[PDB]
């Protein structure tokens, strides 16, 4: 069954389109004959247009509001099968030339949406007396139903396709479904066909790039949630449209919105904040630097020569972790933070400087730069830092500008416990607390390879021994909430699916 979404384009794309997952947007010559069911609304804007096999209009989308059958300004338009418009209101307006349609009622083709049924310009339906309205009401809708209410796998009608994953009482866990079927359009599919992906809902779609990302866990591409900002290859300063750009001014800015993996080498320069007259760019607003907070990888060198004076650290690069030196400044340096006014270095994420060296000079008020052990950051043995001309180490120690004692001697990007390459005790995600909340604390987390991992929220804290041995409801040792078998769960499974989608009562 061909599936689709100027006129000639849709004319040659709807030539077959037995079932349309989008909308019958026939706008502005008899190219369609077998459009059985449309999963959406029908933007039909014309005299001789069969539309004979159009049976169902699901109204997944609308022109303005509940506009299922939108028309305007078609006597020979026999939509004789258009006898049930599901979840939509017929917008059958401005029909001056349409004939034989006035005699037939326009409401039985709709169900429970007569409030939004306005119409203005026993009984036969369309052109020619050979066709009839074929009343059936005054679960099949348009006329083992031929067309189902929600989902028709092969011949049967179902409100929901068999889920791709099914609870298994044998393993005391919610498992995958051996008979798992992806709900593609109105038909369940053992495997998602037409090279489509596995959407969060289970409804196969060919574009899941909005608020999500594409991931291949099995033989079929599957769309998963965009963990923070997901991957977005983006051109850097010197490669691409910015080939001859000299910095991230107020022109190439925004072009870096949600740009995660910069494919070039960023050129933060004083000319960016001052603005450049020759290149016709206005001064860069310091608040616009938060656009660069999305960067997590630079396959080049991150050169920073100017920062807003109201900012005491590199907050715009707090998510920058990689500075892979495919292109290097002066052939030696990848991170080139030079002559800034940063009190703390601020690169609390920076963990992998692969190729180039590091020069951190002119930071008259940055002390923690020398404290870091940069042998861990370097990815090769030919790299050596050039941290000189910073704030005096002796004066820094005397003034107390030394980071927390709750940090490993490995170093630190700043005074806050968030900014520390390694911490003396265990670490709570971004930060590193004095100790995990093993016995005292609200999060009541647990130690995992020297890292605080908060226990599953549906397990109650234990005030005698450790709150939970491992992450997840199973490993929690105390559970005031209900428990499913030997594991913890939110509530007992009641409305679940079994061998034939049976409601497993389970236990009380």
């Amino acid at each position, epitope marked *: 069954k061909k599936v689709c979404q100027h006129f000639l384009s849709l004319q040659r794309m709807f030539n077959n389109c037995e079932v349309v997952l989008g909308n019958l947007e026939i706008t502005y010559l008899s190219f369609l004959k077998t459009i059985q069911e449309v999963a959406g609304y029908v933007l039909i804007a014309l005299e001789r247009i069969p539309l004979e096999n159009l049976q169902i209009i699901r109204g997944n989308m609308y022109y303005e509001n509940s506009y299922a059958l939108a028309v305007l300004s078609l006597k020979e338009l026999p939509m004789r099968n258009l006898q049930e418009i599901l979840h939509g209101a017929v917008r059958f307006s401005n029909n001056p030339a349409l004939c034989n349609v006035e005699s037939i009622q326009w409401r039985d083709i709709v169900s429970s949406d007569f409030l939004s049924n306005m119409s203005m310009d026993g009984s036969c339906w369309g052109a020619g007396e050979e066709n009839c309205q074929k009343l059936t009401k005054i679960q099949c809708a348009a006329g083992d139903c031929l067309v189902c209410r929600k989902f028709r796998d092969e011949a049967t009608c179902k409100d929901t396709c068999p889920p791709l994953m099914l609870y298994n009482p044998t393993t005391y866990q919610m498992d995958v479904n051996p008979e798992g079927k992806y709900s593609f359009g109105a038909t369940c599919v053992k495997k998602c066909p037409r090279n489509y992906v596995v959407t969060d809902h289970g409804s196969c779609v060919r574009a899941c790039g909005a608020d999500s990302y594409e991931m291949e866990e099995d033989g079929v591409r599957k769309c998963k949630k965009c963990e923070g900002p997901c991957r977005k290859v983006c051109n850097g300063i010197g490669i691409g449209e910015f080939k001859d750009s000299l910095s991230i001014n107020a022109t190439n800015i925004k072009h870096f919105k949600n740009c995660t993996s910069i494919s070039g080498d960023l050129h933060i320069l004083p000319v960016a904040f001052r603005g450049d007259s020759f290149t*016709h760019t*206005p001064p860069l607003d310091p608040q616009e630097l938060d656009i660069l907070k999305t960067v997590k990888e630079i396959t080049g060198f991150l050169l920073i020569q100017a920062w807003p004076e109201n900012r005491t650290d590199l907050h715009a690069f707090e998510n920058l972790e990689i500075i892979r030196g495919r292109t290097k400044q002066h052939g030696q340096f990848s991170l080139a933070v030079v002559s800034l006014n940063i009190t703390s270095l601020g690169l609390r994420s920076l963990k992998e400087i692969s190729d180039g060296d590091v020069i951190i000079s002119g930071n008259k008020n940055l002390c923690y730069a020398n404290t870091i052990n940069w042998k861990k950051l370097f990815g090769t043995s030919g790299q050596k830092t050039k941290i000189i001309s910073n704030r005096g180490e002796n004066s820094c120690k005397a003034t107390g500008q030394v980071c927390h004692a709750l940090c490993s001697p490995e170093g630190c990007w700043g005074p806050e416990p968030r900014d520390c390459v390694s911490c003396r005790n265990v670490s709570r995600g971004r930060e590193c607390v004095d100790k995990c909340n093993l016995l005292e604390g609200e999060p009541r987390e647990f130690v995992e390879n020297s890292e605080c991992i908060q226990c599953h929220p549906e397990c109650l804290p234990q005030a005698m021994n450790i709150t939970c041995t491992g992450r997840g409801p199973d490993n929690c040792i105390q559970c005031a909430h209900y428990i499913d078998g030997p594991h913890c769960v939110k509530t007992c499974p009641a409305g679940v699916m079994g061998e034939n989608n049976t409601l497993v009562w389970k236990y009380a």
Partner: single-chain antibody
Framework: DIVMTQSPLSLPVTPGEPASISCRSS???????????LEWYLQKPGQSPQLLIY???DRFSGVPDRFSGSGSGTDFTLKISRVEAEDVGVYYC?????????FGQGTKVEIKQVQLVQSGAEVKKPGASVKVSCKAS????????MHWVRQAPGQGLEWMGN????????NYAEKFKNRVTMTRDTSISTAYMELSRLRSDDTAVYYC???????????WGQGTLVTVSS
């Protein structure tokens, strides 16, 4: 280029009078970003040009409020409510919105720290090459475009190109695309200008102006006159 025609030419003004110089552009001085790059550069007789109205109607720091400017579309003008001996000189209605900057004809008004040190004046022969140096001190050299403006005698200022000391990128003008070479020595902070294939009409004063933030040629060099004849 853009013909920056000026309504008055060599206009003489008596002191204490509202002088007005109107300059019109062949094309609309309006850029995509929406800011009109129109500037009025004071060039005192035998002196490096200095900016006055950094915009169509703004004012350069250190320039008194006596100078004013107003205009829209293609028609612009400059207003000088009070004129003194200082206001004497040549005013160049400059445009930056168009890719090649172009100065006006030159309305010579008459009567009816950072410093860029240039080289010395030299006299060469046609077909030779003249390197023109411009030492830069007082600012971060690899942070400002090193523009290379020229002023042919008996003619308005003609742009010839620039160079970015940070990366060495140069943008020669179309008339000088295949004739000139703009280099620089970062270690010792000068930018040179090797103009090869000198010609009879190539005599000019090659100012090494420095592009500012929202205005062009914020600073300038003294000017290296290069007279060439056979």
């Amino acid at each position: 280029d853009i013909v920056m025609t000026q309504s008055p030419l060599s206009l003489p003004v008596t002191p204490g009078e509202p002088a007005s110089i109107s300059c019109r552009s062949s094309q609309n001085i309006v850029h995509n970003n929406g800011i009109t790059y129109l500037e009025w550069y004071l060039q005192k007789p035998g002196q490096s040009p200095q900016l006055l109205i950094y915009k169509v109607s703004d004012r350069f720091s250190g320039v008194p409020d006596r100078f004013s400017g107003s205009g829209s579309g293609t028609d612009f003008t400059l207003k000088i409510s009070r004129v003194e001996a200082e206001d004497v000189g040549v005013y160049y209605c400059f445009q930056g919105s168009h890719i090649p900057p172009t100065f006006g004809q030159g309305t010579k008004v008459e009567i009816k720290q950072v410093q860029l040190v240039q080289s010395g004046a030299e006299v060469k022969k046609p077909g030779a090459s003249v390197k023109v140096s411009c030492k830069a001190s007082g600012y971060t050299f690899t942070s400002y475009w090193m523009h290379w403006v020229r002023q042919a005698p008996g003619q308005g200022l003609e742009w010839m190109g620039n160079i970015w000391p940070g990366s060495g990128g140069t943008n020669y003008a179309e008339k000088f695309k295949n004739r000139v070479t703009m280099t620089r020595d970062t270690s010792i902070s000068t930018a040179y200008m090797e103009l090869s294939r000198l010609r009879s009409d190539d005599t000019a004063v090659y100012y090494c102006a420095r592009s500012g933030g929202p205005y062009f040629f914020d600073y300038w060099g003294q000017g290296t006159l290069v007279t060439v004849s056979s």
